[PDB]
Amino acid sequence: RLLWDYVYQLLSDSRYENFIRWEDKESKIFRIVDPNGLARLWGNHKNRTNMTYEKMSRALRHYYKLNIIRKEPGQRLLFRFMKTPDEIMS
């Protein structure tokens, strides 16, 4: 199961708002509220130990080059999706 899909799933469920949430969902900008908590949930999702935010965020950086995600410059823990799930699956 893919990082971008898992991120969209958490964003779609207000139960996870203490981990991650939309900042401006019209612009698809999201905030990682608890980067360590988020990495822990992701490692759990993939059934593997020793996942960290340093490691998860590296995986997010690969998405920059794939034009799936951009960092919001100078705004800590703020990112945006450049694509919808439909668009990513194309």
Partner DNA sequence: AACCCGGAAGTGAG
Partner DNA sequence: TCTCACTTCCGGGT
Where does this chain bind DNA (CB under 7 A)?
Answer: 2-4, 32, 35-36, 42-43, 46-48, 50-51, 53-59, 61-62, 64-65, 71, 73, 76-78
**Least spacing, CB of residue 4 vs DNA, in Å:** 6
Rounded least distance, CB 73 to DNA, Å:
7
3 or 29: CB nearest DNA? 3
Amino acid at the residue 29: I
Q: Exposed, middle or buried by CB within 10 Å (0-12, 13-18, 19+), for 38? A: buried
d(CA 40, CA 31): 16
